[PDB]
């Protein structure tokens, strides 16, 4: 190592962010020529790529402005593009690429590439031995440096590689993070799905649902299992609401022109129609401009009616004729609705109500009529003289109620009059017989809210046919009774009986308009408008769900209600247990609890798209013969495929074989690949037009050796379709190893690397060296015992060492008599010159324990020391005297005193 930068001095590049420069700045510098210039200092990321920067400005006068993207290029003379997979299956050998790119004109670089030691990966590199290679990169060229790594534990592991240039001060280090995932599969199961809906099939209290832990039969040990609970709402709203065509009621507009009675007859349909369209907002299809004309006509009719105002604030068709109580009641009722439409005078309404109260008041709650109206059809439902004291007083009370809100401070006697009228109404309510009279009385008494108990039962039972209020008379009477009943039910907030009456009223096909139809049209339109205004679709959700989880001490409370967009709720829990959910409130909801985790890898986890045959044999330069090919399991020949072969270090392909195979049909080799071997040919690519899915008609070729390196990296083979890389099949081969798989000692899912020397070292060894090597920090237990029995297993040799006598006991306080298990490779037996039925002194580390407390199976690694003890009768030999004396002195020294450390 001359003129070579030390590995310590080399700094590795780790920061590889996919996006940065997430800063906010304001342009406040002194502008020049209407332009403000701002200078910023930034640090370029270590990643070698093209950075695109987009700037968006928002000025207080110009607005949003997007500038053209700016491209920044980061360049280096020589660099490395370390390619790793996003995730690597645990306990599965994987291959990664370290491609070195050089862009010099006519300079050839002799580079040294090294991989740092990572405890989480079982690579060829060791603490004492460094896995490094030497390569030659010609000018303007890229050279691949594949590396094989076997992941051990899951998590965000890091892989670091370095490259150094000979005779130059150039060095590049690349460190990249990869997420090692435990072997398995992304599988999810539906833990449970239930419906949360109280007040149906529930209980007097609150529904409770207990969700037990999921199965998780194939759950990988020590893997997170996140449980997601989703609460979903179903705000169904469809009751078949039906309106009335606005274009078919155009005949309802009438110009108000008459001597009081006729003027009101004309005006009432217009005002009620205007109110109906205003409530339903049907002016879009009825004519927006016509509303102005309707309002003009309404105000003209109102002024005309005022023209006949009596001195005492009363209303009559003729000034000379005495006023009529029913006529003024209808007057005030009509004016009450039109308060919001036109600029009505509150003084007139107050005077009218005061006159009505003061004329005859309610000494007992009875209204008397003295001046019958000239038009006998105006009364309509009041034509019958049967219990007229009920219908008349109820109608007058309703009229007062409509106008109560406007004129309330001027007259304070309205509440008392209302109470007296009520008391009279309920005084003899049992005597009502006619359906119309009962309906009007119920509607009048419903506004106050004191028509309950037997009154409500009587009102409901009066409904003939369960869906109509019919009497033996004209259709006008039935329509008025139905409107009264609909209004009463709407005021009572009894929605379970509204849809039928509304449906029948819609189906009645009655629009009115003409002679003796003002009352029916007015009432039906008012009832329809009231229903449209007050008809909430469904019961607003009020769910209050409490989730109790044993892991979480505090319950999780969630509220789901309408008009808040909260019908969709999600919760997550890191622990899966037998939790509970308690519902509450009014509404409908559904819970879905689903658990996500990592299932067991099973045995089907393979390539699943190709069956790969790879073999290596010796020659009949070693010049081995290597065979690689694949078979398709499908029903038809696959498309073009690519085979990538990474040869072991020091091995190259045969140029003659490649040249001979190039002319073969159905097979092509790139020209650049053919002319090679100037520096190395580790990576080879073959393009196959098709692969037979029925027979294995493939080839084999010779591979030569040019450089001899100990611990040759196992060769790798990959095959993948040109149109899909996920369906790539990989294999490993090695002349010595059975299938090119790195040796490791594993129990259950816990595996540890085994690519290490069988022992520290073996001669000039003396007592001082033995003492120095026997006093390491890891030296905990030293045993001198006779190895007799040895067992063979399918993975590694097992030796049953019987405790003849204990010299020093470490963490494990084992007495004399028990037997221990030592797991070592069969090959290491010759390295340690172990012999059956012979005495040996061994001591190892404290972290080498394999198994549970009861099962302390030991592992003989590169740190465990084992030495041969000559037999009692074998020390007599002259050459063994020194060794026996040294062993005895070492044993006596440690036993009496022991290693200071």
């Amino acid at each position: 190592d001359e003129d070579i930068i030390a590995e310590e001095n080399i700094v590795s590049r780790s920061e590889f962010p996919e996006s940065w420069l997430w800063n906010v700045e304001d342009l406040k510098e002194p502008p020049k020529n209407g332009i403000s210039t701002k200078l910023m200092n930034i640090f370029l990321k270590d990643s070698i790529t093209t950075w695109e920067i987009l700037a968006v400005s928002m000025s207080d006068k110009k607005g949003i402005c997007v500038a053209d993207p700016f491209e920044v290029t980061v360049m280096q003379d020589f660099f490395i593009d370390l390619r790793l997979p996003y995730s690597v299956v645990r306990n599965e050998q994987v291959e990664i690429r370290a491609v070195l790119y050089n862009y010099r004109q006519n300079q050839e670089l002799k580079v040294r590439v090294e991989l740092l030691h990572n405890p989480a990966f079982c690579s060829l590199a060791t603490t004492k031995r460094r896995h490094q290679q030497t390569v030659t990169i010609p000018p303007k060229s890229s050279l691949s440096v594949p590396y094989v790594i076997v992941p051990l534990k899951t998590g965000l592991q890091e892989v670091e590689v370095k490259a150094a240039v000979y005779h130059h001060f150039i060095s590049d280090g690349v460190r990249k993070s990869l997420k090692v995932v435990p072997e398995g599969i992304r599988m999810n199961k539906t833990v449970a799905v239930r419906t949360l809906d109280p007040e149906r099939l529930g209980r007097e209290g609150v529904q409770k649902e207990d969700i037990p832990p999921a199965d998780l039969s194939d759950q990988v040990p020590d893997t997170e299992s996140e449980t997601r609970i989703l609460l979903q709402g179903t705000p169904v709203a469809q009751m078949t609401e039906d309106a009335v065509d606005a274009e078919r009621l155009k005949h309802l507009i009438v110009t108000p022109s008459g001597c009081g009675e006729e003027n009101m007859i004309g005006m009432t349909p217009t005002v009620i129609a205007v109110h109906y369209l205003d409530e339903t907002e049907q002016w879009e299809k009825f004519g927006l401009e016509k509303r102005q004309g309707a309002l003009e006509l309404i105000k003209k009719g109102y002024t005309q009616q005022l023209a006949f105002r009596q001195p005492s604030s009363a209303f009559a068709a003729f000034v000379k004729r005495a006023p009529s109580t029913w006529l003024t009641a209808y007057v005030v009722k009509v004016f009450s609705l039109a308060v919001n439409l036109i600029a009505i005078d509150s003084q007139v309404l107050c005077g009218a109500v005061k006159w009505l109260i003061l004329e005859k008041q309610k000494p007992d709650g009875v209204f008397q009529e003295d001046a019958p109206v000239i038009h006998q059809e105006m009364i309509g439902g009041l034509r019958n003289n049967n219990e007229k004291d009920m219908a008349l007083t109820a109608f007058v009370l309703i009229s007062l109620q409509e106008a109560k809100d406007i004129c309330e401070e001027q007259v304070n006697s309205l509440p008392g009059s209302i109470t007296k009228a009520g008391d009279f109404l309920e005084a003899n309510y049992m005597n009502l017989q006619r359906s119309y009279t009962v309906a009007i009385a119920g509607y009048a008494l419903a506004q106050m809210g004191r028509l309950k108990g037997p009154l409500l039962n009587k009102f409901l039972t009066t409904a003939k046919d369960k869906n109509r209020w019919e009497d033996p008379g004209k259709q006008l009477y039935n329509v008025e009774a139905t409107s009264y009943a609909l209004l009463a039910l709407l005021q009572l907030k009894d929605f379970d009986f509204v849809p039928p009456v509304v449906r029948w009223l819609n189906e009645q096909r009655y629009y009115g308009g003409g002679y003796g139809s003002t009352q029916a049209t007015f009432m039906v339109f008012q009832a329809l408008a009231q229903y449209q205004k007050d008809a909430p679709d469904h019961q607003e959700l009020n769910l209050d769900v409490s989730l109790q989880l044993p892991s979480r001490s505090s319950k999780i409370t969630h509220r789901i209600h309408w008009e808040s967009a909260s019908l969709l709720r999600s919760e997550e829990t890191k622990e899966n247990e037998g939790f509970t959910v308690t519902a509450e409130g009014k509404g409908q909801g559904t819970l879905s609890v689903v658990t996500m985790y990592h299932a067991k890898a099973k045995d089907q986890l393979t390539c699943n798209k190709f069956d790969l045959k790879v073999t290596i044999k010796p020659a009949p330069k070693n010049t081995m013969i290597l065979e690689i090919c694949t078979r398709y399991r499908g029903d038809q020949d696959a498309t073009m495929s690519i085979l990538d072969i990474s040869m072991m270090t020091g091995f190259a392909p045969d140029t003659d074989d490649l040249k001979q195979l190039a002319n073969g049909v159905d097979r092509y080799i790139s020209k650049y690949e053919l002319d090679k071997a100037f520096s190395d040919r580790n990576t080879l690519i073959i393009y196959l037009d098709k692969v037979s899915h029925s027979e294995d008609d493939c080839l084999a070729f010779k591979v030569h050796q040019y450089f001899n390196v100990e611990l040759i990296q196992p060769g790798a083979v990959k095959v993948y379709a040109y149109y899909n890389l996920e369906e790539s099949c990989t294999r490993f081969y090695h002349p010595e190893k059975e299938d090119g798989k790195l040796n490791k000692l594993c129990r259950d899912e816990l595996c540890r690397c085994a690519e290490e020397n069988c022992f520290i070292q073996k001669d000039k060894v003396t007592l001082e060296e033995r003492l120095d090597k026997a006093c390491e920090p890891g030296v905990d237990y030293v045993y001198k015992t006779r190895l007799v029995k040895v067992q063979l297993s399918n993975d590694f040799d097992e030796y049953i060492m019987a405790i003849e006598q204990t010299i020093k006991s470490g963490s494990d306080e084992v007495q004399v008599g028990q037997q221990r298990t030592f797991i070592s490779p069969i090959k290491c037996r010759e390295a340690l010159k172990l012999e059956e039925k012979k005495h040996y002194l061994m001591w190892g580390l404290s972290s080498d324990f394999w198994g549970e407390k009861p099962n302390l199976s030991y592992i003989i690694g590169k740190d465990t020391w084992v030495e041969h003890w000559p037999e009692e009768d074998e020390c007599q030999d002259e050459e063994n005297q020194k060794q026996c004396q040294d062993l005895g002195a070492f044993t006596e020294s440690m036993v009496v005193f022991g290693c200071p450390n």
Binding site: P311, L358, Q361, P363, D364, D370, G416, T419
Partner: protein
Amino acid sequence: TKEGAAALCKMKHLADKVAKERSQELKDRTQNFAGYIEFELYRIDYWLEKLNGPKGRKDGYAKLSDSDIEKVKEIFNKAKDGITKQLPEAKKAGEEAGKLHTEVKKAAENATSYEENYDWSANALQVALNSWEDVEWQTPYKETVEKLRELEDAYQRGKKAHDAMLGYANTAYAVNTKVEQEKPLTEVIAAA
């Protein structure tokens, strides 16, 4: 036996109904007599003032005969004098009923059957229901019936006062809309 549980549930429901429905309703119906007697007295006074007042043209009363005016004034004054004496009886009764209702509400707050809802009666059934049921929470139930009967008597006093007031109240309103039309002295005095 389940009969005891049903009776207990019925008694609880009746007590709740009395506490939340009858108690509140009863008080609101006792303070209205005072507001009606004064209102009718004011209306009678206004009617008397309008008769032969600073101006005329008061519908038919303007042309009313001189002799009939004296009788109308006399009867109006008699009715006004008669109706005044009833005010204190209702005024005291209102406050008494309010205080008793407050006490009963406080006492109530201190403390199978569904098919029987047809009874719809919670007037004096608590004590009798407890009587059949017998054949810490029991002690307050004893005075509830007594308080309810006292409230009923207090309300009956005001009801009787209001009913008596009607005798003098109705006569003035009659002669009003009798003379209000074209009715001469004859019928008027004949009925008076």
